[PDB]
């Protein structure tokens, strides 16, 4: 199907307690394959997927060298924004950045994105056309003029439309066994008495990939979406995800309720009853 490669960068200031912390992670789809932590011993980019382990030193030295640059850049960046926002050099602040590309079923470019956020809030973002920026406030406007100046977005488009897709396809072929799979949800239900007259039906989707899934409860066909408890899709820790939705049902009506599960690794949306 479609695939994606994305890099996430976080950067938090540590007023007086040393350099700013810097954490870079990189995913293909919902699978992490590299990391760099400024507080980790190695001070190198490290792998996290099996398929990237054998990439050669040249590739590692490259990625480390360029992640270190990102690190140092965000170091300056923290300083810039404390200025723009007229803030004290006493408090801690966060710079977050995410960029990557999506590819379609044909493995041809689909879209690209590149966004910043100061203190957990939108700052500036590349637009669909990969040439125009969206400044969220006045300081972001300044950066926008600065970047339109250096033709920033022309160079980005060239990474996102080429290098990025070029490399995503490489990864996808190297980690074929892993990235190109889809695990269908292994589902089941549990029943617990909330009281003498009430039971809780809980619908489980275990061990699936990718994370995207849909769990709905229904009663005689009518979506119970408002009386349904539904937790965030969560990582199992093994490269698969879990999720459940619960409804509180009147004893004696277990039969009127269905759980419907839809995933990419499923040919036909499962339907589960307590029956």
């Amino acid at each position: 199907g479609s695939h994606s490669m994305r890099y996430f960068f976080t950067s938090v200031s540590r007023p007086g307690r040393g350099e700013p912390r810097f954490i870079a992670v990189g995913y293909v789809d919902d699978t992490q394959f590299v990391r760099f932590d400024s507080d980790a011993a190695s001070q190198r980019m490290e792998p996290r997927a099996p398929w990237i382990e054998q990439e050669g030193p040249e590739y590692w030295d490259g990625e480390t060298r360029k992640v270190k640059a990102h690190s140092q850049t965000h170091r300056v960046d923290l300083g810039t924004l404390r200025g723009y926002y007229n803030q004290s050099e006493a408090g801690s602040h966060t710079v977050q950045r995410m960029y990557g590309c999506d590819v379609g079923s044909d493995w041809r470019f689909l879209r690209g994105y590149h966004q910043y956020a100061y203190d957990g809030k939108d700052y500036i973002a590349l637009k669909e056309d990969l040439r125009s920026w969206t400044a969220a406030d006045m300081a972001a406007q300044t950066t926008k003029h600065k970047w339109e100046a250096a033709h920033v977005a022309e160079q980005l488009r060239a990474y996102l439309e080429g290098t990025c897709v070029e490399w995503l396809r490489r990864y996808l072929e190297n980690g074929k066994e892993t990235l190109q799979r889809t695990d269908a949800p292994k589902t089941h239900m549990t029943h617990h008495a909330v009281s003498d007259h009430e039971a809780t039906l809980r619908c489980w989707a275990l061990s699936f990939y990718p994370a995207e899934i849909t769990l709905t409860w229904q009663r005689d066909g009518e979506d119970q979406t408002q009386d349904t408890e539904l937790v965030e899709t969560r990582p199992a820790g093994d490269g698969t995800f879990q999720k459940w939705a619960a409804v509180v049902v009147p004893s004696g009506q277990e039969q009127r309720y269905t759980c419907h599960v839809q995933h990419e690794g499923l040919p036909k949306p499962l339907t589960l009853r307590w029956e």
């Binding site: 990189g26 590739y59 360029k66 990102h70 850049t73 960046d77 810039t80 710079v95 490399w167």
Partner: peptide
């Protein structure tokens, strides 16, 4: 593969 461009705000 990461991006090579230094990019300052």
């Amino acid at each position: 593969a990461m991006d090579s461009n230094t990019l300052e705000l």
